[PDB]
C-alpha cells in the first residue's frame, strides 16, 4: 500500500562490484603515454587497494 | 575616429591555447634520446601542469 523506492535487484545481489573491478583491471594494465611513470604507480596503487 | 590596435580574433576567443595544447602534448609523446630521463621527466611534469 505504500510506495517505495527499490534498488535495481542487480545491486542487492553484488554483482555491480564485478563490473567495477573490471574496469579498475583494465585501468590498471593500460598505460599512462602523456604522463609520467610515478603518477602510474600512485593510481595503481591506490587501485590496488581496492 | 580613433586607431586601435586590435588582436586576431582568434585570441578574443580561446582557441590558440588549444593549438598550445596540441604542441605540448605532441611533445609529452616524444622520448628525448640525446638525453637522460631525469630531463625529460623535469619537462614532461612542467608540462603537465600546464
Do not use: C
Not at 500500500?1 to 535495481?8: D, E, K, M, P, T
Not at 545491486?11 to 602510474?40: C, W
Amino acid at each position: 500500500g505504500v510506495l517505495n523506492q527499490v534498488l535495481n535487484d542487480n545491486i542487492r545481489n553484488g554483482h555491480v562490484v564485478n563490473q567495477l573491478m573490471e574496469a579498475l583491471m583494465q585501468l590498471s594494465r593500460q598505460q599512462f603515454p602523456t604522463m609520467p611513470v610515478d603518477y602510474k604507480r600512485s593510481i595503481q596503487r591506490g587501485i590496488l587497494l581496492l
